[PDB]
Design an enzyme around this catalytic site. Sequence first.
Site, PDB file in Angstrom:
ATOM      1  CG  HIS B  41      -0.383   0.278   2.517  1.00  0.00           C
ATOM      2  ND1 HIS B  41       0.009   1.540   2.910  1.00  0.00           N
ATOM      3  CD2 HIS B  41      -0.143  -0.534   3.574  1.00  0.00           C
ATOM      4  CE1 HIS B  41       0.482   1.488   4.142  1.00  0.00           C
ATOM      5  NE2 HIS B  41       0.403   0.241   4.568  1.00  0.00           N
ATOM      6  N   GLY B 143       3.358   6.698   9.222  1.00  0.00           N
ATOM      7  CA  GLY B 143       4.645   6.540   8.584  1.00  0.00           C
ATOM      8  C   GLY B 143       5.495   5.414   9.133  1.00  0.00           C
ATOM      9  CB  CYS B 145       3.372   1.286   7.223  1.00  0.00           C
ATOM     10  SG  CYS B 145       1.765   1.778   7.869  1.00  0.00           S
TER      11      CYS B 145
END
Lengths: 306, 306
Positions: B41, B143, B145
């Site tokens: 993603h 952020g 991830c």
Amino acid sequence: SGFRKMAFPSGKVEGCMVQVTCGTTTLNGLWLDDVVYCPRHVICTSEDMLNPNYEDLLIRKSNHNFLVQAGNVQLRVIGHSMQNCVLKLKVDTANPKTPKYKFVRIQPGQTFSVLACYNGSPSGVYQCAMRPNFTIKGSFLNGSCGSVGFNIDYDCVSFCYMHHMELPTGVHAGTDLEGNFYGPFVDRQTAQAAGTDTTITVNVLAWLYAAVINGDRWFLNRFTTTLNDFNLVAMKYNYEPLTQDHVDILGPLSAQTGIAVLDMCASLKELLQNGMNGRTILGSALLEDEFTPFDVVRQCSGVTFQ
Amino acid sequence: SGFRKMAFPSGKVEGCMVQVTCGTTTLNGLWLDDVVYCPRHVICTSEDMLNPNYEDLLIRKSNHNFLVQAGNVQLRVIGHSMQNCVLKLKVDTANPKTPKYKFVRIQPGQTFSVLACYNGSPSGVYQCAMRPNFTIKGSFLNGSCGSVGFNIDYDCVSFCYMHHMELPTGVHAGTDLEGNFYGPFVDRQTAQAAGTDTTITVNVLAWLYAAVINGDRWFLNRFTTTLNDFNLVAMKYNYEPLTQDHVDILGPLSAQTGIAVLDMCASLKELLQNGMNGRTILGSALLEDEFTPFDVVRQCSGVTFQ
């Protein structure tokens, strides 16, 4: 979201840990440039620790009786010096992995990361606070002496603690990197008393703010109080008194959440006098005091380092 | 002596964290050899996350739309592939700091260390467990991830988790390093339900043994019980049932302390049905379940790693 007792990344410290041996004794040392720092009681046996005369003990040793090991590469001790309770073993080759570093003496209530080591090799990292009585409640087994505590200011590693002893009460004592003990402790195997341990009130208040930031709001009470009344309550529960410097430090937390520092104190006062009654805050049934106001800002804003 | 929630030293992982950008989105990636692993993603905007068609989204991107940054050095994406929910960005230069590593899929109840990162830069490390409902209660900001979980088996780093999403309930979900989600979660911004979360009973029992090793003995009761009766009590308090495999795993702890596994269960049963009544175990007012039996042995014996 969420909250955890986060430690600093340890990579910059891992490359500095070496194994030091004098006779039988094995502990850890800190290899920075061409100097290895380690507790001076490495020159002691189990018999000498009961009443050591370090000056006389060190004089019987020479540069050749120290075996400093880094992995499978051995360093040559070219010189030794005793600074207070620390030993400076000068070697011939500077550590290539030497980071930008600083030596600092922290105050009670500040937090830092400990890299627990055995035989010069890292085993784990955890975050802890210096208690008001200058002890730390860590996890140290035999041979872990010489493990270091540190903070990371972006690119600079700030070494603040070196572990020396476990007191007979199971708590841990140590020195700064200049070898001056934290608290009234000496590196000798005798009964030593730590003071009464108090709760770090400013740390608890910062943790309450973290709870508000992450959704725990039930403790926000309907009262207020003053900085003279709260300290009256705090003294009864062995909480350290709150000063105006502490209020100024909590300022940004108050601005971010809209709750005045004095208002949060009234919430804490009710928690102290009436308990938590089977409820939790941030997953805890006890009031937590090992987060500084700076730690909360760091975790809630996600600051990174080199 | 003493007990702490210890994390693994993070140095081997720090050298593998890179920053990946596709368009506006910035998250973390894992640079191993000549491949960068990151959540798929990254190719999404805030609008696409509500209903993403990843196949169609990735087709509009090409190798030139990916900017992988490591510090102040930029990597060139020479190829991209999507494996389940992970993106494999092949680059031209192998990571010189690539450690001996493994990809593993852990089971519920196992523990691991998370290296929380932002913009490709480490911020902190903490230890956590995979809940029985395949979530983790971590600390992840926007952020973060692409941050990875890992264990260290002496010289080999075992990557087991990559963070993908924060559920609307504030809990965190992610995948293994092959991109298969832990649990019934999809990488899409929609309401997703995690199962009922239970307490990891075998972990609690290992922690009780740690308490005995370190001097906390008040909970050692005067009763005993069987493996069918205890599970009857455990089911009532949302505790996962104990099997014979769990008993075999606790064997060395039982031998070291002299307390039979079945005897310790009777102590825990009394704790469950009657509470802890204002007393603490290892500094905790709650029963702790994020220590595995292996973690307790590791900390109580001081095993070290490369």
